Design an enzyme around this catalytic site. Structure first.
Site, PDB file in Angstrom:
ATOM      1  N   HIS A 282     -29.869 -33.153 -10.343  1.00  0.00           N
ATOM      2  CA  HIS A 282     -31.204 -33.613  -9.982  1.00  0.00           C
ATOM      3  C   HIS A 282     -31.964 -32.611  -9.125  1.00  0.00           C
ATOM      4  O   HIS A 282     -33.185 -32.729  -8.999  1.00  0.00           O
ATOM      5  CB  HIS A 282     -31.120 -34.953  -9.252  1.00  0.00           C
ATOM      6  CG  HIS A 282     -30.585 -36.070 -10.094  1.00  0.00           C
ATOM      7  ND1 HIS A 282     -29.286 -36.101 -10.550  1.00  0.00           N
ATOM      8  CD2 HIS A 282     -31.174 -37.195 -10.562  1.00  0.00           C
ATOM      9  CE1 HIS A 282     -29.097 -37.196 -11.263  1.00  0.00           C
ATOM     10  NE2 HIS A 282     -30.227 -37.878 -11.285  1.00  0.00           N
TER      11      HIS A 282
ATOM     12  N   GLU B  76     -28.617 -53.003 -21.201  1.00  0.00           N
ATOM     13  CA  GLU B  76     -29.708 -52.572 -22.068  1.00  0.00           C
ATOM     14  C   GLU B  76     -30.585 -53.745 -22.488  1.00  0.00           C
ATOM     15  O   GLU B  76     -31.806 -53.598 -22.616  1.00  0.00           O
ATOM     16  CB  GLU B  76     -29.151 -51.844 -23.291  1.00  0.00           C
ATOM     17  CG  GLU B  76     -28.248 -50.661 -22.963  1.00  0.00           C
ATOM     18  CD  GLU B  76     -28.918 -49.615 -22.092  1.00  0.00           C
ATOM     19  OE1 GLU B  76     -30.155 -49.468 -22.169  1.00  0.00           O
ATOM     20  OE2 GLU B  76     -28.205 -48.936 -21.327  1.00  0.00           O
TER      21      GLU B  76
END
Ligand SMILES: *[C@@H]1O[C@H](CO[C@@H]2O[C@@H](C)[C@@H](O)[C@@H](O)[C@@H]2O)[C@@H](O)[C@H](O)[C@H]1NC(C)=O
Ligand SMILES: *[C@@H]1O[C@H](CO)[C@@H](O)[C@H](O)[C@H]1NC(C)=O
Ligand SMILES: *[C@@H]1O[C@H](CO)[C@@H](O)[C@H](O)[C@H]1NC(C)=O
Ligand SMILES: *[C@@H]1O[C@H](CO)[C@@H](O)[C@H](O)[C@H]1NC(C)=O
Ligand SMILES: *[C@@H]1O[C@H](CO)[C@@H](O)[C@H](O)[C@H]1NC(C)=O
Ligand SMILES: *[C@@H]1O[C@H](CO)[C@@H](O)[C@H](O)[C@H]1NC(C)=O
Ligand SMILES: *[C@@H]1O[C@H](CO)[C@@H](O)[C@H](O)[C@H]1NC(C)=O
Ligand SMILES: *[C@@H]1O[C@H](CO)[C@@H](O)[C@H](O)[C@H]1NC(C)=O
Ligand SMILES: *[C@@H]1O[C@H](CO)[C@@H](O)[C@H](O)[C@H]1NC(C)=O
Ligand SMILES: [Zn+2]
Lengths: 194, 584
Positions: free
Chosen positions: B485, B355
């Site tokens: 997806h 991150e």
């Protein structure tokens, strides 16, 4: 004759981007009695010993004071690049200087407490290609001082004059007030002596 | 002139966007970290304001023809605003498409499969996936696999058939050939000499990359098959495809869960520093300050004070409802935050670095124009994030930090186990991604008629992935739609390129750091030269062709699989000796 450190002991200390500067010439100063009024937390001096500052004849003395939280000491150090050192205040190391971070005790009643600690997060010109940031000169003021003088009500509030844009970050003050002083000595050097 | 008018229009657009986007982002952040009705409605009103402003501004950009624009940056920003999208459809068809998309998403999100012999035992998607990820029984996995295939994916076929045609209609309305071409256009750029890329060229590029990678996947497939034949006797042929339901997960996307039955030697213990972290009294703040220290060691800037004051690094003690998913936020006016509820573990230690790599990439191009503050393409951000966790996980870095004793002994067995686990996670998913995107492209283009969607699908599954279905599936089934997806309308090629780029970055950062020995033992810490050439690529944002940005760091304009094979060279050499002549 001596000089009064009373102007820095009255009123609400200004924010970092609008720091207040005092210049002393031809005065018999007593630094040992000034720092005794504050709970000194950090005293870091460059090109002068902390004890060596209190003695010696200088041509001029300069004190730049503002309101600044002590936990942000790491962002005011030399070699650190950020909004504080670029858009707010950049210390000048050409002359012997010291930086003091001190907490105002309950005894000092002449110093009012500002509502928030505030600083600037950006100050730039805008163009179709992006942001052209403006940086402070060592010991100078930000070009966005006129826009910042309008005041910030919330965090990341921006003021724009069509060409310059500035953004401000504020947060409330908790507990006592923490203050920052920058003492610079400039070297005829018989004017200011202890 | 037209270019001067375009320039001043973009100046005022930037002025207004810088405020509206931050207001919307701040409302979204306030909602996510503090779930309530008032926060949701404030988020919705901010999003509506931003959407209305963006639409009204995009209606104005249509008045600047691109033939009279010469600057590669003004033209780049005008191309983004002039896009129509689903607005090309004829009113009713747009509403029908929205209804179809919501129906498919809701159908996927509400899956439910019951035990054929125990009807009282019905599991949702999460409890069903937990069964696949830990079971070791052939029929117990088989009924879960078939039930999810015939429950959720069986009812998405009529919706997917109309979804294909509506997407093709809107893509052909946007001056494309088909919707697959619309998806492929995310990799198109313009350049002077060799810096240009086409959307008709991505197909052959990924084809040749997969041809380069296939010899390693064959060795890994043979090894995994040889171990599964002992794990599941009498169900796997010595030289045949692997059964679809035995590959750890629901869809066989990742082969990680096979590691327990594929580890070369159970005697060797894996590295674990969670106990040491707990023993040394680590916290979330210490983990993130260590991550910041690592990123500063290579010459990247530190974090802003607002990052420390405003980010949420632990789960709240006040009982507030929080969407606990690790995310990095670039809210606008120099406002970077991280939302994750960390614990004292090694996985959180690595995700912190991931991150913060996202945050450093965001901080790099912060002075670009509003529309040009993204990665060079869709795979750059995640590749940059993962190339840091590649360096952090090495025992050299942990030993230097002191997280494991300096007397730690490194033998080739541990290196082989580490490489094998990484190959299971990394190499084992490339054929799946490649074949899924190939099937979608062929379906949207029209090379697979609606009468043979499954007949081709499983056919490719046997030729590219080497996986055989346990039960025959007719044309009433839509197995690919069973994936997230696919039902939720997401591009899948992002995961194929972001791996190819990843190692291509790492080698470039290990040649600059003057690393000696195997590539998998490379740590870029305490190397300002690597950080310099990294930030040279990170600062460009979206203002340059992604080929130029790729050359800025990897010294090449073309994606290559040679660094990926060079990373896994010891594992390939060991696997060749282990398999012998069993590969196929
Ligand atoms: C955005 O910033 C670009 C690069 O950053 C600047 O140049 C490098 C070499 C360093 O000196 C760094 O500190 C500077 O910020 C500029 O080239 C570009 O012009 C900037 N954008 C605009 C619109 O001026
Ligand atoms: C300076 O002030 C201190 C404060 O206690 C005092 O003790 C000291 O004598 C002073 N020095 C002078 C006036 O030279
Ligand atoms: C000065 O502060 C001290 C210590 O907090 C306290 O005891 C004393 O009463 C204060 N004096 C005045 C005049 O407020
Ligand atoms: C969460 O949202 C509520 C909505 O009323 C607000 O009052 C509260 O202060 C928020 N909690 C925080 C910021 O911790
Ligand atoms: C978008 O549609 C408009 C008509 O609504 C058309 O003039 C314009 O050219 C289209 N934009 C592009 C990029 O094709
Ligand atoms: C770039 O353009 C040239 C000339 O138009 C073309 O031959 C070439 O295929 C293009 N490059 C790529 C990578 O598609
Ligand atoms: C693998 O074994 C470990 C113990 O070494 C266990 O924690 C883990 O859940 C196992 N994984 C699977 C997929 O069985
Ligand atoms: C980087 O260098 C510092 C000081 O030179 C050292 O303490 C640290 O262990 C080094 N880091 C790594 C990962 O080797
Ligand atoms: C590791 O190296 C030793 C000799 O150093 C060799 O005998 C052994 O086979 C190797 N093991 C593996 C798993 O490569
Ligand atoms: Zn990520």
């Amino acid at each position: 004759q001596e000089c009064d450190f009373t102007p820095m002991l009255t009123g609400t200390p200004p924010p970092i981007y609008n720091f207040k500067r005092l210049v002393f010439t031809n005065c018999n100063y007593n630094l040992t009695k000034l720092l005794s009024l504050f709970q000194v937390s950090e005293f870091s001096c460059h090109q002068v010993s902390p004890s060596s500052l209190a003695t010696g004849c200088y041509s001029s003395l300069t004190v730049d004071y503002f309101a600044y939280s002590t936990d942000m000491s790491s962002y005011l150090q030399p070699g650190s690049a950020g909004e504080i050192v670029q858009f707010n205040y950049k210390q000048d190391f050409s002359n012997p200087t010291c930086r003091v971070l001190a907490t105002v005790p309950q005894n000092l009643t002449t110093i009012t407490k500002p509502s928030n600690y505030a600083y600037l997060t950006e100050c730039y010109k805008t163009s179709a290609y992006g942001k052209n940031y403006l940086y402070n000169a060592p010991g100078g003021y930000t070009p966005c001082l006129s826009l910042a003088s309008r005041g910030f009500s919330t965090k990341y509030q921006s003021h724009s004059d069509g060409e310059l844009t500035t953004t401000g970050y504020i947060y409330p003050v908790t507990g006592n007030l923490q203050m920052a002083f920058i003492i610079s000595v400039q070297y005829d050097t018989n004017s200011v002596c202890p | 002139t037209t270019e001067e008018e375009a320039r001043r229009f973009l100046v005022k657009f930037n002025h207004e966007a810088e405020n509206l986007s931050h207001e919307s982002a701040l409302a979204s952040w306030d909602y996510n970290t503090n779930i309530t009705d008032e926060n949701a409605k404030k988020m919705n009103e901010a999003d509506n304001k931003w959407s209305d402003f963006y639409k009204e501004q995009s209606k104005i950009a249509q008045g600047f023809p691109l033939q009279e624009i010469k600057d590669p940056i003004i033209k780049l920003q005008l191309q983004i605003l002039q896009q129509n999208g689903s607005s090309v459809l004829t009113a009713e068809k747009r509403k029908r498409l929205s209804t179809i998309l919501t129906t498919m998403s809701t159908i996927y999100s509400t899956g439910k499969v019951c035990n054929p012999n125990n009807p009282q035992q019905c599991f949702t998607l999460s409890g069903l996936e937990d069964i696949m990820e830990k079971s070791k029984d052939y029929h117990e996995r088989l009924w879960v696999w078939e039930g999810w295939r015939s429950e959720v994916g069986k009812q998405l076929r009529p919706l997917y058939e109309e979804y294909v045609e509506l997407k093709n209609e809107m893509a052909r309305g946007n001056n494309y050939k088909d919707y697959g071409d619309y998806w492929r256009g995310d990799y198109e750029t313009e350049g002077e000499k060799g810096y240009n890329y086409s959307r008709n060229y991505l197909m052959e590029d990924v084809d040749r990359i997969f041809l380069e990678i296939k010899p390693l996947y064959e060795q890994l497939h043979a090894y995994v098959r040889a171990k599964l034949m002992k794990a599941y006797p009498s169900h796997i042929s010595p030289t045949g495809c692997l059964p679809a339901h035995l590959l750890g997960d629901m869809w066989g996307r990742f082969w990680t869960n096979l590691y327990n039955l594929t580890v070369p030697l159970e005697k060797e213990p894996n590295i674990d520093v969670t106990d040491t972290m707990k023993k040394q009294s680590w916290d979330a703040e210490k983990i993130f300050k260590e991550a910041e220290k690592f990123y500063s060691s290579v010459g990247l800037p530190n974090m802003t004070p607002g990052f420390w004051r405003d980010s949420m690094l632990t789960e709240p003690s006040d009982g507030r409802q929080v969407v606990c998913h690790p995310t990095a936020w670039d809210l606008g006016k120099n406002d970077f935050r991280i939302k994750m509820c960390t614990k004292v573990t090694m996985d959180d230690f690595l995700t912190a670095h991931h991150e913060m790599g996202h945050i450093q990439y965001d901080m790099a191009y912060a002075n670009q124009s509003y529309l040009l503050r993204n990665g060079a393409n869709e795979g750059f951000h995640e590749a940059v994030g993962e190339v840091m966790s590649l360096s952090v996980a090495t025992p050299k870095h942990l030993k230097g930090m002191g997280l494991l004793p300096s007397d730690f002994s490194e033998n080739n067995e541990t290196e082989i186990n580490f490489l094998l686990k990484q190959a299971l996670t990394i190499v084992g998913t490339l054929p799946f991604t490649y074949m899924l995107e190939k099937w979608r492209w062929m379906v949207f283009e029209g090379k697979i008629p609606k009468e043979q969607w499954m007949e081709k699908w499983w056919e490719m599954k046997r030729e590219i992935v080497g996986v055989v279905e346990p039960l025959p599936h007719d044309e009433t089934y839509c197995d690919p739609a069973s994936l997230f997806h696919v039902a939720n309308d997401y591009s899948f090629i992002r995961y194929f390129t972001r791996t190819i780029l990843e190692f291509q970055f790492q080698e470039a950062l290990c040649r600059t750091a003057k690393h000696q020995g195997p590539l998998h033992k490379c740590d870029i810490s305490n190397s300002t030269e690597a950080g310099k050439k990294l930030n040279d690529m990170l600062k460009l944002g979206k203002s340059t062709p992604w080929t130029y940005a790729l050359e800025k760091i990897a010294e090449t304009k073309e994606m290559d699989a040679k660094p990926l094979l060079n990373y896994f060279n010891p594992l390939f050499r060991w696997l060749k000796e282990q398999n012998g002549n069993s590969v196929g």
